[PDB]
């Protein structure tokens, strides 16, 4: 007679019955063959193996089965570990996963206030949920949890959740579910609303959470909930030529990247040749001490030397470089014209005497062209140096090619795009070139000493210092109009509420956040979206789709930021902004109408124009397409608005990830190495119409299908048809 | 035929002019003056200028100087003093003639509308016109000596000229040396009560002028004009936490922009500690730094290879250590971070480093055994010591700190501890890091305040004394305390960047009194350098030394206060270089001073003092070529050597073979005359060892650096090979 070893030591005979009846539960109602998971565990079984260890072997085995001809095989793996972690749980706060009546409860609607307490009581949550939830709240919510919302998690999805997303104890033990995940982050949400509202919005937050419609950022999925509410994903930092600020920003780098992340910092007004990149080198060593772009203007002197960091005793490996590039540069390139590099100093001196200092880098378009074409001729030599623009071009997309980098910011597009261009202008992006927001330098005050006490106290005036409190919609479950007017505003409430409940480390961030109230939207499952209303990538069906559903977005996003302003009050900042003169997107209300009637959708565009005249908007910016990384993982979503890079594929820690219905649309889907990306930016470029940010575009190239020549077509043809970045360059 | 002369023009070769030139430039100075004349007949050409004729006697006048014949450096010296007034007497518009039509360089006249035109164009500070009348200018103008300027070898001049003499925004030399050392003089003297001033501007004129001592460099170039940086040092100290180690890498940025002499200790620091120093490197570049770390450190392996590159590494040795290396025995280091932890929860937290000596060690055996595997590494004590000579030999570095007597003598003990040295590692001074405090935002208006609260940040305000000249009880009972007054007055004048400094310097207004001309001093008592004589001599010498300073720093605390931490000091006590009066008063008969000291502990337990610190032995450097002195207590390098700056010894032809040079010294006695001179010494000295790789091996380099601590030395600075 066989034995095995059960989680209680002891000792039982080998029952093949019972490992029938859980592969059984976890192939109910999926397109796979429990038989075939039955005769592997036949093989996988030896005598005085344990329980534990029988579990782990049908969960790998299933993941192992996960393919494009049959993907169901991923939900029985994921419900495998479900039922695993159920267990562990249910010990660890010493509750049965059996009721009075012997029914199968993997939750436990009774210990949900006693296990938050003593949580709560420990240090792990934080003491907010207590003091904004009485015991009968708690018991209430307890109650609205749906664990039939687990069955809608991929093994990856699942994998990736439980290895850095749910809670854990001191000892590492995960303590939390993910229905009380979803319930604890809408409840943390919640708290800035009113006391008799409460309650029906964390219900409304976790059911759009929990039925995978939206997601919030990773900082929010694992924070919103703790003592520590760190839900900030990005910062863009503005340096001044002056010794204070610039260490002032490399300890901005340092805090920023140990708590945080997405770091930007832009060195455009620092001096040409010590020079600009040995302050580079200072931000690379506080990086590695404990993730950042840095961005210089393609008309710096030193760019030469800027463009070569990641590839001769002046590199820099743990950060990303990006350019600034003016349309004069693209203008020049034309005609394969020369390219004058000028030192920011000398260039500051001539237009400062020339009329609170003013650089070249503080204009932009028509006005920065007029200053460009003086100062290349009546500067001296010394300031200046002469290189050809086609040589340069050449030599940044060869970089571009072997590294991925540099990033592209097309400042002109994106500063008379600004909405809020009435407070400043915009220098860079972020990290990972979705963010475009007004940014400024601090300023700095003499310090003081009071001999008596031994106490120095120094001010500085807080300036502009972007932060991007980031969600997406998922396109697989939000595409109709009736989804979209429900969601929107939905999200842009979470949103604003993120902002409440942020824990500042930085206190310029919290001066910009609270005149602002920025917020970035974007997108998930947007290749599966089309495939599935019957869609080609390379078409005229495309971009004719992508404008009509990106109209709707828009709208509805306006709307929900509407609402929000005639309840709380428009942002600080908001008199004097595009919005308030009926100016959306950077177009007249004629234009926009026109579009929404060759679109087939028909908007009341104009009455929402006078609406935000009137009462205003909540929030300075709403959309921004970030690459969406994790949480669409979890959401077993195809990443943010790239074509997938595979029909299957894997990863390490093994993270098997299908397309949605890849069985069903198998031809359907075109794999991202295999499209012509002239489409890709077109599609970009039309979504661009409906967007006041930007849009983290990748290119996907093939060395054996592209060259030199073309690579250089696509980066005109972004910049020719209105595109403010360019990101990542695979191959 | 023809000679070019300033005023463009054209004359007739004069032979006589240049023999008149060169006869004053060799005026009771023992060299040939028709050497120098044939030189000048070879060197003549058609069309020549006389400045060009002017270069060429001032050079090859330079080239003769040699250990056999010196005193060509002070014809080299006048030459070139002589070019000087003529080009700034051109400069500010006066003549070298007076009525009589006798030669007068120095202009008394000019001196107040000089300086008047020159505050006007900001080169000069304004407190010179705000603290002085044109009747006050007009007494010192008159009360300048000439014939001082007679003092200066060409090195000397050479340097003051290149550096330190104060140049108009076109690049000219605008001031001579006397009215340099006047106008230093009168800014010193600013501090002073009005009916007093002008009578201690000419005693501060007067010490500086005759080369009985010198300020530091700073000073020296700096005390005129309106931002007075006199500042020569800084020790910064750095707690493990993101916000004060990017303040200290701040500072480190100011400091090396505007001052020097940077020293860091970087001991509290959790190990993997070298991203820290490579980021201090950074910052360094993008504008001559030490680095100190303990040696029970679990990064020390790395820190030691740092340099085999523009910071210098130090390294914090305990009693424990070289207790454990007399066995041969095993060493084990630590990690500050879970030794904090361990010690801070079996009681603000407090770490290993933050005790010494006695307590350390009983700290140090717990932590050694109870600690786990991971905070811990074992290494044999030999191992390791021989690593660090190995990189001493080769690079000259690390510096060593025997922080346990460091601690143990530190008169300031009762305000906090010691975790390592300055650069030069002369410093000895109680330090500990600043306190942060989180910051505020007004959402009304823009503006955030932060607050920290101020650590001990040493600042060092330097001075040295000639021993060439100063060296008697009287000479020394004089010039002592006139020293000990002018740094009293330089922490007043000094323009401070760093708010931490302020701080500091205003509760402890240490101070740092060195010497120059030490193996001068020695040579011309007769006194042989590997010699019972030498240990005799120099207790003798450094007990007057230290006498005259504290009755210097009392006579000021009787006038302005003794300093605001004086009061739980080992001084207020009666505890002077950590010994009791009786042991004192028994050395001082055994050296034949027979000084009153029990009276002077008396009235310091009464009056105080004005300076927490002292007496400092700090590098000499550019302070002692202009003096013409022997570096420091350093023996010679040579009787004669180039830099073109030929350096000789005073009297080098007289005494050639009593000098004798640093590599054939058997520096076990440099050693032991070093710790007869510590007795007397409240700081540290900046103690050089000169090896020679034929005469020198592994094991007898060990024994000179365990001397060193045996004996009681608390520092060792560079190994030069
Ligand atoms: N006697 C047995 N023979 C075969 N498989 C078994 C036997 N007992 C448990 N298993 C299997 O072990 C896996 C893990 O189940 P489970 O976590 O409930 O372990 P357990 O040791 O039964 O724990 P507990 O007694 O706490 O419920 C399941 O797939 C189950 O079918
Ligand atoms: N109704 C159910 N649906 C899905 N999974 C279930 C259900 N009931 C139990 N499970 C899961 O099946 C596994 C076995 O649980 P169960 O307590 O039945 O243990 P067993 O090993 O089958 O029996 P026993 O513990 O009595 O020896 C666990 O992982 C549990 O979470
Ligand atoms: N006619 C001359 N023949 C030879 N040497 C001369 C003659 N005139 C000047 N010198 C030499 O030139 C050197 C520099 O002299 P000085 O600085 O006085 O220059 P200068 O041209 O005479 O200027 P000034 O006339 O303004 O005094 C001296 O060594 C001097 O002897
Ligand atoms: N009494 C003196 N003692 C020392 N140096 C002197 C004396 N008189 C002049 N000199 C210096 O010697 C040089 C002589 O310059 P000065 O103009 O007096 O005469 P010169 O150049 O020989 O001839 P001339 O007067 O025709 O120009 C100058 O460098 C001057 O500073
Ligand atoms: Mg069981
Ligand atoms: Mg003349």
Redesign the pocket.
């Given at each position: 007679t066989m034995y095995?070893i059960?989680?209680?030591g002891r000792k039982?005979?080998?029952?093949?019955n019972?490992?029938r009846?859980?592969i059984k539960f976890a192939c109910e109602g999926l397109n796979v063959d429990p038989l075939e998971l039955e005769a592997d565990a036949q093989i996988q079984f030896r005598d005085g193996i344990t329980?534990?260890e029988?579990?782990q072997l049908?969960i790998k085995t299933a993941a192992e089965k996960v393919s494009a001809e049959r993907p169901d095989w991923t939900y029985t793996a994921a419900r495998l570990l479900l039922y695993?972690l159920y267990?562990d749980v249910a010990?660890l706060r010493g509750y049965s996963l059996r009721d009075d009546l012997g029914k199968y409860k993997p939750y436990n609607r009774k210990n949900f206030y006693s296990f938050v307490k003593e949580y709560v009581e420990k240090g792990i949550y934080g003491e907010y949920l207590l003091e904004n939830y009485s015991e009968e709240d708690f018991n209430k919510l307890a109650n609205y949890i749906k664990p039939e919302r687990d069955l809608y998690f991929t093994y990856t999805g699942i994998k990736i959740l439980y290895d850095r997303y749910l809670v854990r104890d001191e000892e590492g033990r995960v303590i939390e579910l993910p229905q009380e995940m979803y319930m604890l982050i809408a409840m943390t949400l919640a708290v800035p609303e009113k006391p008799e509202e409460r309650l029906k919005w964390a219900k409304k937050f976790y059911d759009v959470l929990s039925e995978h419609k939206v997601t919030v950022a990773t900082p929010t999925l694992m924070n919103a909930r703790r003592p520590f509410t760190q839900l900030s994903s990005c910062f863009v930092l503005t340096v001044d030529d002056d010794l204070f600020d610039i260490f002032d920003n490399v300890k901005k780098a340092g805090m920023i990247s140990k708590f945080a992340g997405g770091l930007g910092v832009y060195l455009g007004k620092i001096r040409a040749t010590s020079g600009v990149i040995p302050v580079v080198k200072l931000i690379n060593d506080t990086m590695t001490y404990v993730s950042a772009s840095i961005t210089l203007d393609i008309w710096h002197k030193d760019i030469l030397d800027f463009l070569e960091v990641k590839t001769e005793r002046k590199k820099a490996h743990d950060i990303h470089p990006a350019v600034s590039i003016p349309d004069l540069f693209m203008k020049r390139l034309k005609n394969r014209e020369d390219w004058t590099l000028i030192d920011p100093y000398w260039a500051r001196q001539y237009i400062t005497r020339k009329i609170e200092p003013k650089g070249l880098e503080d204009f932009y378009g028509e006005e920065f062209e007029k200053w460009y074409l003086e100062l290349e001729e009546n500067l001296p030599s010394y300031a200046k140096k002469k290189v050809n623009s086609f040589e340069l071009w050449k030599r940044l997309l060869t970089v571009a090619f072997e590294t991925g980098e540099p990033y592209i910011f097309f400042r002109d597009e994106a500063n008379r795009k600004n909405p809020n261009k009435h407070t400043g202008m915009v220098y860079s992006s972020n990290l990972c070139h979705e963010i475009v927001q007004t940014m400024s330098p601090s300023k700095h005050e003499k310090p003081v000493l009071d001999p008596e006490t031994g106490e120095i106290t120094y001010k500085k005036e807080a300036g502009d210092l972007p932060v991007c409190n980031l969600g997406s919609v998922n396109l697989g479950k939000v595409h109709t109009e009736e989804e979209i007017k429900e969601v929107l505003p939905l999200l842009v409430r979470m949103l604003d509420n993120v902002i409440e409940m942020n824990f500042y480390a930085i206190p310029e961030a919290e001066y910009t956040n609270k005149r602002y109230r920025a917020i970035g939207i974007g997108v998930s499952n947007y290749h599966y979206c089309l495939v599935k209303n019957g869609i080609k990538w390379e078409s005229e069906e495309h971009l004719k789709f992508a404008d009509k559903l990106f109209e709707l977005i828009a709208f509805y996003a306006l709307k929900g930021s509407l609402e929000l302003a005639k309840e709380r009050g428009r942002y600080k900042l908001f008199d004097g902004s595009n919005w308030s003169k009926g100016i959306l997107f950077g177009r007249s209300v004629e234009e926009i109408e026109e579009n929404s009637r060759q679109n087939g959708n028909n908007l009341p565009w104009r009455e929402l124009a006078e609406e935000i005249k009137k009462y205003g908007i909540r929030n300075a910016y709403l959309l921004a397409l970030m690459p969406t990384g994790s949480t669409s993982l979890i959401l077993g979503a195809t990443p943010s608005i790239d074509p997938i890079f595979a029909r299957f594929y894997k990863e390490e820690n093994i993270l098997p990830q299908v397309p949605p219905e890849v069985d069903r649309f198998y031809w359907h889907y075109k794999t991202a190495y295999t499209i012509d990306h002239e489409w890709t930016i077109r599609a970009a470029a039309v979504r661009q119409k409906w967007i006041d940010q930007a849009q983290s575009l990748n290119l996907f190239v093939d060395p054996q299908n592209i060259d030199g020549p073309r690579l250089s077509r696509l980066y005109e043809l972004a910049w020719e048809l209105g595109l403010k970045t360019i990101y990542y360059l695979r191959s």
């Open positions: 095995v059960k989680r209680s039982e005979k080998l029952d093949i019972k490992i009846i859980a329980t534990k029988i579990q049908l695993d267990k010990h």
